[PDB]
Design goal:
part of a larger assembly, 7 chains, A mainly alpha (about 160), B alpha+beta (about 80), C alpha+beta (about 100), D alpha+beta (about 130), E mainly alpha (about 25), F mainly alpha (about 120), G alpha+beta (about 60), C: alpha+beta, Alpha-Beta Plaits, two-stranded antiparallel sheet, about 20% helix, elongated, E: about 25 residues, mainly alpha, 1 helix, binds magnesium ion, binds zinc ion, RNA-binding, RNA-binding (chain F), structural constituent of ribosome (chain F), Ribosomal_uS13 (chain F)
RNA sequence: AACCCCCGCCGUUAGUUGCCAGCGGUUCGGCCGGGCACUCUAACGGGACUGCCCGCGAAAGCGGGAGGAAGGAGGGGACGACGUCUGGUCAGCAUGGCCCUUACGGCCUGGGCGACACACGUGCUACAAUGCCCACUACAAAGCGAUGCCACCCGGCAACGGGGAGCUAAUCGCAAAAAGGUGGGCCCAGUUCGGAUUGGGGUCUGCAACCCGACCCCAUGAAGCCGGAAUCGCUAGUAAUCGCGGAUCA
RNA sequence: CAUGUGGUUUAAUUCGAAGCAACGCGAAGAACCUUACCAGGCCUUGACAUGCUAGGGAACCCGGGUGAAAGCCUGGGGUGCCC
């Protein structure tokens, strides 16, 4: 990215909810270009969301993903010869991409057999503010403050 | 695996054949290790070429389905 | 009734001979199915550019062998005679059928 | 009397016929919701219709060949769009800015030599 | 996988028809 | 049940059950059921002894297996051993019989890597 | 053993197996395009001089 | 840089490819009558020029917007300066010099280049439930093919063999595309994961498959539960993943 | 597990390529052929080009014995174009 700045790739909305967020989230589930399988596993969980709670999977997804949005992180700025781990803002772009990634990463971490059953639970506990995906969030935020001293390097 | 008529150099057979007539000696030098072991070989002793010299490999009734090559190791460390 | 084949490496020679049969066959004979361009074949040859150890960076050429087809309905003696001593391609190949 | 547009994309092309009717969709025989079973991309290709404010007002007999099922799907949106824009230049004024045109130049890349996949080079090693 | 000589996937990879595949 | 001597396929699909037996695989599995009228999906935990004793005398006779098999296999080698054939000598130094690699790999008959240098 | 083997390949007497390809101009053993009977090398050399009819430098 | 090829969009020319798109016939299969609009085929052109609008600028040109299939080099290939490494190759070939010459030349048989106490590189298959098994059904491209590809029928579980039809190939065949979609089995196990190793039997090419082939079936189910320090590819139809083709060649 | 390379071994395990820019590289087909290596048998104006001298014989075609084959030993038929 030494030249321009790179265009944040655009994305066709959901073939269902019409949500771009869901479109992206699917890609994270997607294994080896098999997009079909990914969507399937997602929607299967989507309905499972209601099967458990009288709530629709819509806001369950937003509520969840919004609780896994890390407010601030630690970037290692190697200035002054040494590599200081400075705490600073998370670009709105990152908060999303990271959340979704952690979401699915923590989801795969779950033990249960079927994959869609993991995306469901992880999604629920996430909106509930309790999931293991949230645990990575609570960490990165604390890891940021455990070094608030060097924050005077915030570029 | 060559099923229809198991190969075996004719001159080699021809050689053992005249030996089956009078039941003579067993002295015999070959160079066709591919040649299959025929039941008429039993009791003989064919010196096979491994690539450097003739190895006096006796041939019992046990060794038959194989070839003369499986008894003249080519690698000098076998 | 007249099914002429027209194959040749150079594509340009095939367009001259294509019109060469359209002029004589039509301007002095019955119906003639226009020049139908058949799907061209291709012989690609990937060769190691160097004479020695140097996989990749190799060059590769190809040998476009063309095809063209034209038909006619009536054996007007005017055409069979004219298109028999006036025709003269070069690297083209002319093979006709009934 | 009818409507026609030529859909194209990725070694796959599609003739589209938007014959006026209720909404009977069918392509290469078989039914829309039959040729594209289990495939979620299906409901997408029919989007150009429900977009122009008229789903239940056109039957849809169509053909398509080459490519893969989804590759055929890409051409469908192109055919359906071109079909109605053909016999109605007013949809162009509001369907063009909404992006339903362009054959989508995205196409397979020619595998270069030395590489593995026109880009994917063989693994490096200094040792 | 593509190494199970005694399955559909296997013979496909190897390019051989064999028993576990249609023929005559 | 103790099918084919001590061998004991138990608590799972009858077809895969007999697989665990030393002389049977996915092949003889489908076939052994189609020679005694047994249902493949049925569990070994729940199936009539009339059906069990059926495979009992069936398999124990239909073909050699277990140690009988494990014995003859030993015999083939002892034969190649005492003959002096190439196929035998490879068994001697434990090298691959299929004359495969040797400069590399071939570990599955050489065991763990020796290193040394 | 470069010339005699050239006379040996064009010989094609014994088993049809023992016969083999051999570049017509240079006389190489390996890399024998059957269509020309040539080796990759000369085949490349000739085409560059167009001495091979209709053959052209591919590029797509 | 540009002039060249491919891919994009539109047109002209052409109808043994395709098409009731239109009708008729129909053993209702584009099969025949028939038709070239259209898919396609392969030649020739149109097209994009910071040409238009706004903003900056002395200019070149830059940023943003419009119309457009395609905007500032649209994407990909071809093309790689004077020279450098006294780089590689005299075992492609040519070529100075040196050297051999009943052998450093020649033919053949057999062996070897395929050794194995190890080390490394490039890779293949995996360690599995986004999974594997089976049955069923669906969509490619590019190519190649007359002592060649095999429609199809008989035999064998099978590789494959006997008999046998079309084609110098947009007309016939290689042909099964796979991932997919549908349905059933599997239940977290060193397992229905994984196919290494080995035993027995068997087929095809070739005089000849011991050394040293390939493929088939039964049995044998190894190491391997995601890999130390370290390290590679890729910025989009890319990487990841699935299958197909050809050169070589019995 | 596949293949290439080091090393090692071997009668031989043919040669080259050597950081990047050698190691699925020359090889886009090592079972004999390929083959450049080793053992043995054997040929030695040569399997390939040109030219001269000398003796017999046409070109040709078939077989015999010996042998792993190469090669070596060797019978029969044939009785051709012009001066
Ligand atoms: Mg900058
Ligand atoms: Mg430091
Ligand atoms: Mg982003
Ligand atoms: Mg080629
Ligand atoms: Mg393409
Ligand atoms: Mg390549
Ligand atoms: Mg690809
Ligand atoms: Mg398995
Ligand atoms: Mg049959
Ligand atoms: Mg084998
Ligand atoms: Mg290795
Ligand atoms: Mg020599
Ligand atoms: Mg050959
Ligand atoms: Mg070769
Ligand atoms: Mg310019
Ligand atoms: Mg096009
Ligand atoms: Mg135009
Ligand atoms: Mg045509
Ligand atoms: Mg009738
Ligand atoms: Mg009828
Ligand atoms: Mg009928
Ligand atoms: Mg019908
Ligand atoms: Mg009717
Ligand atoms: Mg039809
Ligand atoms: Mg017709
Ligand atoms: Mg036309
Ligand atoms: Mg076209
Ligand atoms: Mg013009
Ligand atoms: Mg201007
Ligand atoms: Mg304007
Ligand atoms: Mg103005
Ligand atoms: Mg402005
Ligand atoms: Mg102004
Ligand atoms: Mg201004
Ligand atoms: Mg400005
Ligand atoms: Mg000025
Ligand atoms: Mg602009
Ligand atoms: Mg610009
Ligand atoms: Mg601009
Ligand atoms: Mg450009
Ligand atoms: Mg360059
Ligand atoms: Mg280049
Ligand atoms: Mg200079
Ligand atoms: Mg230099
Ligand atoms: Mg130099
Ligand atoms: Mg120099
Ligand atoms: Mg160097
Ligand atoms: Mg020289
Ligand atoms: Mg030269
Ligand atoms: Mg010289
Ligand atoms: Mg001198
Ligand atoms: Mg000399
Ligand atoms: Mg001499
Ligand atoms: Mg001397
Ligand atoms: Mg020599
Ligand atoms: Mg030899
Ligand atoms: Mg190395
Ligand atoms: Mg490595
Ligand atoms: Mg590999
Ligand atoms: Mg599944
Ligand atoms: Mg699957
Ligand atoms: Mg389908
Ligand atoms: Mg057949
Ligand atoms: Mg039938
Ligand atoms: Mg046809
Ligand atoms: Mg025909
Ligand atoms: Mg046809
Ligand atoms: Mg094929
Ligand atoms: Mg093939
Ligand atoms: Mg097909
Ligand atoms: Mg399936
Ligand atoms: Mg069920
Ligand atoms: Mg279990
Ligand atoms: Mg284990
Ligand atoms: Mg299981
Ligand atoms: Mg075996
Ligand atoms: Mg055979
Ligand atoms: Mg054959
Ligand atoms: Mg084979
Ligand atoms: Mg064990
Ligand atoms: Mg992995
Ligand atoms: Mg590093
Ligand atoms: Mg895989
Ligand atoms: Mg993988
Ligand atoms: Mg082949
Ligand atoms: Mg053959
Ligand atoms: Mg030594
Ligand atoms: Mg070696
Ligand atoms: Mg070595
Ligand atoms: Mg050495
Ligand atoms: Mg070397
Ligand atoms: Mg002589
Ligand atoms: Mg002599
Ligand atoms: Mg002479
Ligand atoms: Mg003789
Ligand atoms: Mg002699
Ligand atoms: Mg004589
Ligand atoms: Mg005589
Ligand atoms: Mg006489
Ligand atoms: Zn050459």
């Amino acid at each position: 990215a030494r030249r321009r700045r790179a265009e944040v790739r655009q994305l066709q909305p959901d073939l269902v909810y019409g949500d771009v967020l869901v479109t992206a989230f699917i890609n994270k589930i997607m294994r080896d270009g098999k997009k079909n399988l990914a969507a399937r596993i997602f929607y299967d969980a989507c309905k499972i969301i209601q099967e458990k709670t009288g709530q629709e999977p819509l806001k369950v997804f937003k509520q969840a993903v919004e609780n896994v949005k890390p407010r601030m992180e630690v970037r290692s700025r190697r200035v002054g010869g040494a590599n200081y781990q400075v705490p600073m803002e998370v670009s709105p772009r990152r908060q999303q991409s990271l959340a979704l990634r952690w979401l699915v990463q923590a989801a795969n971490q779950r033990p249960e057999r079927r994959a869609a059953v993991r995306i469901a639970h992880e999604l629920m506990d996430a909106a509930e503010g309790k999931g293991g995906a949230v645990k990575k969030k609570e960490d990165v935020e604390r890891m940021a403050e455990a070094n608030r001293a060097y924050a005077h390097y915030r570029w | 695996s060559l099923k229809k008529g198991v190969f075996v150099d004719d001159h080699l057979l021809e050689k053992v054949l005249e030996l089956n007539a009078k039941g003579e000696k067993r002295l015999i030098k070959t160079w066709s290790r591919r040649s299959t072991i025929v039941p008429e070989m039993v009791g003989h002793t064919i010196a096979v070429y491994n690539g450097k010299q003739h190895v006096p490999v006796y041939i019992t009734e046990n060794m038959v389905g194989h070839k003369l090559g499986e008894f003249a190791p080519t690698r000098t460390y076998r | 009734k007249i099914r002429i084949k027209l194959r040749g490496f150079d594509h340009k020679t095939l367009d001259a001979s294509a019109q060469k049969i359209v002029e004589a066959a039509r301007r002095s004979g019955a119906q003639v199915s226009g020049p139908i361009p058949l799907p061209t074949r291709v012989r690609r040859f990937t060769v190691i550019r160097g004479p020695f150890k140097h996989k990749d960076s190799r060059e590769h050429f190809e040998l476009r062998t063309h095809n063209r087809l034209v038909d006619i309905i009536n054996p007007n003696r005017k055409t069979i005679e004219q298109l028999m001593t006036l025709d003269l391609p070069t690297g083209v190949e002319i093979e006709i059928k009934t | 009397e009818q409507y026609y547009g030529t859909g194209r994309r990725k070694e796959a092309v599609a003739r589209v016929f938007l014959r006026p009717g209720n909404g009977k969709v069918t392509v290469n025989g078989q039914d829309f919701n039959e040729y594209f079973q289990g495939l979620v991309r299906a409901v997408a290709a029919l989007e150009p219709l429900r977009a122009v404010d008229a789903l239940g007002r056109f039957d849809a007999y169509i053909t398509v060949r080459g490519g893969g099922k989804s590759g055929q799907i890409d051409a469908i949106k192109l055919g359906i769009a071109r079909a109605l824009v053909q016999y109605n230049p007013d949809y162009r004024a509001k369907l063009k800015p909404l992006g339903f045109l362009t054959r989508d130049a995205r196409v397979v890349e020619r595998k270069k030599y030395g590489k593995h996949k026109a880009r994917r080079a063989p693994q490096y090693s200094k040792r | 996988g593509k190494g199970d000589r005694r399955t559909r996937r296997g013979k496909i990879w190897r390019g051989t028809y064999g028993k576990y595949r249609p023929r005559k | 049940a103790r099918i084919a001597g001590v061998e004991i396929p138990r608590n799972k699909r009858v077809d895969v059950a007999l697989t665990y037996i030393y002389g049977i695989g996915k092949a003889r599995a489908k076939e052994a059921l189609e020679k005694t009228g047994i249902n493949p999906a049925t569990r070994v935990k729940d199936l009539t002894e009339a059906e069990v004793v059926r495979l009992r005398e069936y398999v124990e006779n239909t073909w050699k297996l277990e140690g009988e098999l494990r014995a003859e296999v030993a015999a083939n080698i002892k034969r190649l051993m005492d003959i002096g054939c190439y196929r035998g000598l490879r068994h001697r130094r434990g090298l691959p019989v299929r004359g495969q690699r040797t400069r590399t790999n071939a570990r599955t008959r050489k065991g763990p890597r020796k290193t040394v240098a | 053993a470069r010339k005699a083997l050239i006379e040996k390949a064009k010989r094609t007497p014994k088993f049809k197996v023992r016969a083999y390809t051999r570049c017509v101009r240079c006389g190489r053993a390996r890399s024998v395009y059957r269509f020309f009977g040539l080796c990759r090398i000369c085949l490349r050399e000739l085409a560059h001089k167009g001495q091979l009819p209709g053959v052209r430098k591919a590029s797509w």
